[PDB]
Amino acid sequence: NEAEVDTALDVLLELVVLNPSAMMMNAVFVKGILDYLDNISPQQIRKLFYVLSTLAFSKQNEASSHIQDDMHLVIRKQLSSTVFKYKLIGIIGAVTMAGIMAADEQCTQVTSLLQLVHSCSEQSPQASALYYDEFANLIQHEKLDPKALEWVGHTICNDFQDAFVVDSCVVPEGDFPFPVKALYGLEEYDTQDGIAINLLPLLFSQDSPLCLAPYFRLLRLCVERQHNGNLEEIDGLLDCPIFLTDLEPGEKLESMSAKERSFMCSLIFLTLNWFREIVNAFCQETSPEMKGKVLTRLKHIVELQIILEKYLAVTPDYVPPLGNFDVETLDITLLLHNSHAFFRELDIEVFSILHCGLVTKFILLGPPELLFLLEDLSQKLESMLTFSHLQQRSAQEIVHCVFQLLTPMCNHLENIHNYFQCLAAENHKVQEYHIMSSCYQRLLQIFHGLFAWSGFSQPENQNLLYSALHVLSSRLKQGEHSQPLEELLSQSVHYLQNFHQSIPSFQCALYLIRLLMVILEKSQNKEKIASLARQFLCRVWPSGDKEKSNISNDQLHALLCIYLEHTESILKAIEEIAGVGVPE
Amino acid sequence: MDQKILSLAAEKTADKLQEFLQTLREGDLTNLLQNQAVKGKVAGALLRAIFKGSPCSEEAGTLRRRKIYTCCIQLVESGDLQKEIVSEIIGLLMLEAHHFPGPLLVELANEFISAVREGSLVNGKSLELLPIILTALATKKENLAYLSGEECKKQLINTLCSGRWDQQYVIQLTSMFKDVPLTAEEVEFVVEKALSMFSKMNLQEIPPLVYQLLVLSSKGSRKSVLEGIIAFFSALDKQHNEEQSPSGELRHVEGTIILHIVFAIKLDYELGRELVKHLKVGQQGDSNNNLSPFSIALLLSVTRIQRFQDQVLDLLKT
Amino acid sequence: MQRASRLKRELHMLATEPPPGITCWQDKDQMDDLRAQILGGANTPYEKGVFKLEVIIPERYPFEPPQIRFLTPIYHPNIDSAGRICLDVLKLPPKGAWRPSLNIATVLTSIQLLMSEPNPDDPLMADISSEFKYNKPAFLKNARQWTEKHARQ
C-alpha cells in the first residue's frame, strides 16, 4: 500500500546511491517490476523511473543495456494510448530518463526521444502542457550540456510568437457576444505595436491556449539558460496589452449562468494564470522600470483575483476545472478551493518586490501591490510549512530566505503601518485604510506562520532564532550582542506589543497575540501573556463589516483558550469574564 | 524527390503537400526502400510529412496510409534494417494508428492474423503495433455492422485464438495480450491457446513463457494457469518414470518454474489461496488425484513465505 | 591475469599451430594488441588477398569476448567499411554466444568461415547484402576488385 511503496522506493534510491554495483546484478527483478504498474501513483512512478534510469545509465554497464530497450518499449506502449491514464505515465518515464541520461550519440538519442515525446504529446493539450512543464522542471533542476536546449529553444520561441503573439488590433475577427479589447496593458508600452496576445478568439474557437503559461515558462527557462538570465527579446511580453473582453464585473450580465459564464470565469482564470506566470518570470530581474511594471501586474492580478472570486460567487457550480498537473489531475481523472489548488502556484523569488517601502494614499510600490505579495507569501508558507516547484525545495531554505526578505525588510512596512493607523485613529479613503488593514493582517499572519515553524523545535535552528529575535530586539535598541534566549524573547515581545496602538482589525489582533505566544514559548513570563491577551480583548477593534467578519468564532475560541489558561488564577479570570458577561 | 516534400511540409499542411501527394501516386515502395538503404531519418521525415499531408478526414490519405502501412509491415520483418530505424518506424506507426475508422483497422487486424497464421514472419516486431490497433478498435465508438469496435475486437481475438500459432512466436503473442484491456473470457482463451501450445515446445522456452502467462494471470485468470501446469508436469514426470522403468535438465526446469510461481504468490496473497483450495484433499477427506511430486515441491518451496506456512504444513500432515 | 593466462598459451598456440589460412602474432607496433592475417579463402572473391586484422583483448578475457577489426578493408555484407564484426561470438550472452570454451583461434576460424559464406541475416552493409542476395556476380566482381585494389601487394 501507499506508505510501504513510498518508503520502499526511498530506500531503493538510497541503495543504488550506496552501491550501484551489487544492485546492478539484482537489476533483473527491478526490470521485472514493470509488469505490475497498475497499482502505483505517478509521484511513485517518478522515483521508480529515476531508479531504473540511473541504474541503466551507469557507463560501466552498457552491455546489459537490455533494460534501456525494455524501458523504450514500455515508453512506446503507454504513450500509444487514447487513454490519458497510461499516456501521462509514459511521458513522465520518458522525461525522467532524458534528464537522467543527461550527464554526441548521447545528444542524438536525446533529441530523437525528445521530438518523439513532443509528437506524442502535441495533439492532447494537457499532455503537451505537462511535457513543457516537466521539461522546464528538468532544466531548472539539472545543468545538462546545452545542445538539445539551444536546438529546441530557437524553435520554441518562433512557435510561441506565431501561436499566441498577434499584431495589436483591438477587435480581431470572429463572432463574439463580448466586446474584445487590447485590455490590461500597463500603458507605458505603446498600444499601437506588434506584441499583443490572442485569448478570447482562441477560447471561443475551442467551442494551444491552456498550455500557454507553462509553454512561456519553458520559453523563459530555455532563454534563461542560453542568454544566462537575460529576458532582452521578451520585455514586450511583460507590458503588452492582452486581447480580453470587457472584464468589468458583469452584474448586468447576470441570470446568465450558461456556457458563457463558464467562458468568462475560465477566461479570467487563464489570464490570472498568465499574469502569475509573468510575475514568476520577471521577479529575479533587477531593472527598476521592469520592477515597477511587475508592481502594476501585481495590482492587476489582485484586481482580477477579486473579479474572479466575484465571478465564482455569481454561480458556485461552474467549476473551471484546471488543477496543477503534479498531484491534482489524478484525483479527478469555494474561492479557496481554486485559490491554491486550481491557480498556478508561484515562485519563492516573487518576494524580491516587497523589499520596497510602503506608501500611503489615505494619509500620505503601492499598498495593494504589497497586499498581493504578502497574501501570496501567507498562502505559500501555510501550504509549505503545514505547489510543484516549492515542494522540491525543503521548508528549511524557505524559512531561511523568509528570514532575509521579510523580517529585516517588512519591519519598515510594519513601522510605516504603525504610523499609518496611529494617524488614522487620530483622524477618527476607506478602501486605502482597509487595504492597509489587510496588508497588516497578512504581515502578522506571515509572522505567525514564520515563528510557529516546528523546525525551531530542532536544535540547529536556534542560531536562526538568535539571529531573528536579535534583529527584533534591534528594533528597540542595537548593541545587545550575544543576549540570552529569554532576554531576546522579552525584547522581541516588548517591540511587538507596542503595535497594540496600531492594530485596526481583530484578525490582525489574533495573529499578533498568537505570534507573541509562539515566540514566547521558547522561555514567571505567563503574566506578560495574560496581560497582553487581556489588552487585545479590551481594545476597540473598530467594527467594519469585513472587519468584524475578522472576529470569526473559532478565532476568539483560540484567543480565550490562550488567555483563560495562561492567566495565573484561571478560575478568578473566569469569575471576571462572568462578571463582565452580565452587563452585555 | 524528398527535399521538395520537406519544403512543402516546412510551412503548412493539406494545401500543397496534398497537391504534391496527388502527383506521385505509386513508387512509394521503392522510394522507401532506397530511403532505408541510404538513411532512415529521411524515412521518418517522409512519414511525418506523409501523415501531416494525408489527414484521414479526407479518405484518399487513408489509402496512402494503408498502402505504406503494409509496405513497412513487410519490409521491417523481411528487409533487415538498422535497429534504431526499426524502433522509430514502429513508434511512428503506433503513434498514428489512432486516426482511422473501424473497418480499415479490422482489415489490418486480418492482415496480421493471416500473416502470423501462415506468413513466415521473419522477426515478428510488427506485432508490437497490433495491440495498439486492438486498443483503437475497442475505444473507437464509430459503430460498425457485420456492432461495436470492442465486439469486433472480441471476434478477431477469438479468431486468432481458435487459429494456429507459430512455435517461435507464442512469447510475443502473449506479450501483446500483456498490455491489452481484456475481460475474463478474453484472457481465458489467450491462456488456453498458450496452454495447449506447451506440447510443441523445447523446455528452455517454458520458463519465461510461464512467467508471462502468470503476469497475465494477474488480470483475473489465476486458477487455470496453475491447474494446467500441474497436469502437464504430472503427466511429464509419470512419462519420465515410465522411461526409467535428460533427468537433470527436467529437474532444472521444475525448479525455476517453482521460483517464478513463488514470486507470483509473493506479489499475490490470493493466488496461494486458490492454489490451496485447488489442492486440499480434505474437501471431506477422500484422496484427490490432484497432487504430485512437483505439486508438493511447489508447496514446500512456498511454505517459506510467512503467511501460508503453517496452513500448508497442516494440510500436508492431515 | 587470467587475461595473461589465456594470452601466454594462445600466443604460442597461434604462432606454432594456427588455424588453416590464418596466422597471428603479438602486434609488433602495439605489444598489447595482436596482428592477425587471414589469407584470402578459396572459392571467394577475397582470394589473392592477405587481410590484416587488429585484435583487442579486454582485461577480463576469458569472460569478455575479444574485439576484432579488419585493418585490410573488405567488401562484405556483414563487415562494414571500418571492419566491424557483427558476430554473436564477439557478443555476450543471450545477445551473443561468447564463452571461454571459444578463443582467438575459434573466432578467427569463424571469421574465415564468414569470409567464404556471408550471413544474409545479420548485415552491417544492407546494400552489399541485397547485392549478395540477388545479384551474385556484381557482388563477387566488386569484392574481387576491392581485394586486388587493397589486399594485393
Domains of chain C with CATH codes? 2-153 (3.10.110.10)
Instruction: Mark which residues 434-473 of A lie under 8 Å from B by CB.
Output: none
The residue type found at A102 is A
**Subunits touching B (CB < 8 Å, at least 3 pairs)?**
A, C
In sign, the C-alpha dihedral spanning A305, A310, A311, A316 is positive
CB C47 within 8 A of CB C147: yes
Instruction: Please name the residue of chain C whose CA is at the shortest distance from the CA of residue B34.
Output: C127
Quote helix, strand, coil % in chain B, to nearest 5: 70, 0, 30
Looking at the DSSP bridge assignments, the partners of residue C38 are C22, C51
Verify whether the Cβ–Cβ distance B135 to A36 is below 8 Å: no
| Ramachandran angles phi, psi of C22, nearest 5° | -130, 140
Between the alpha carbon of residue A202 and those of residues A263, A267, A460, B231, C138, the distances in Å are 11, 10, 53, 65, 62
Helix axis angle, B60-78 to B40-53, nearest 10°: 160
DSSP secondary structure, A226-244, as one string:
HTTS--TTTHHHHH--EEE
Q: Taking the CA of residue B11 as centre, how many other CA atoms within 13 Å lie in the half-sphere pointing to its CB? A: 6
Q: Which residues pair with C53 in a beta bridge?
A: C36, C70
* Residue A351 and residue A405 in contact, taking contact as beta carbons nearer than 8 Å: yes
3-state secondary structure of C55: strand
Q: Cβ separation of C127 and B81 shorter than 8 Å?
A: no
Resolution of the experimental structure, in angstroms: 4.4
CA distance B49 to chain A (A): 13
- Taking alpha carbons only, the member of A449, A342, A328 closest to residue A398 is A449
- Cβ–Cβ below 8 Å for C130 and B36: no
Q: The sheet that has A196-198: what strands, in order across it?
A: A165-166, A196-198, A242-244, A181-183
Query: B129: Cβ–Cβ under 8 A, 6 or more apart, which residues?
Result: B90, B93, B94, B97
Instruction: Give the number of other CB atoms < 10 A from CB of residue A390.
Output: 16
Are B95 and A80 inside 8 Å of each other by CB?
yes
Sheet arrangement for strand C50-56:
C22-26, C34-39, C50-56, C67-70
SS3 call for C71:
coil
C-beta of residue C16 within 8 angstroms of C-beta of residue C100:
no
In sequence order, the β-bridge partners of residue C68 are C55
Q: Give the three cell numbers for residue B53.
A: 499531408
Which residues of chain A does B88 touch, with a Cβ-Cβ cutoff of 8 Å?
112, 116
Set of cell numbers at residue A557: 475560541
Solved with: cryo-EM
CB A217 within 8 A of CB A277: yes
Nearest to C72 by CA among C7, C151, C10, C137: C151
- Any idea what the Cα angle at residue A27 is, between residues A24 and A29, rounded to 5°? 160
* Set of chain B residues whose Cβ sits within 8 Å of the Cβ of A77: 94, 128, 131-132, 179
Q: What is the Cα–Cα distance from A4 to B309, expressed in whole angstroms?
A: 23
Contact A87, A333 (CB under 8 A): no
- Looking at residue B37, its amino acid is A
**Residue B8 in contact with residue B23, Cβ under 8 Å?**
no
Q: How far is A482 from chain B (nearest CA, A)?
A: 60
**Angstrom distance (rounded) from CA A179 to CA A170:** 10
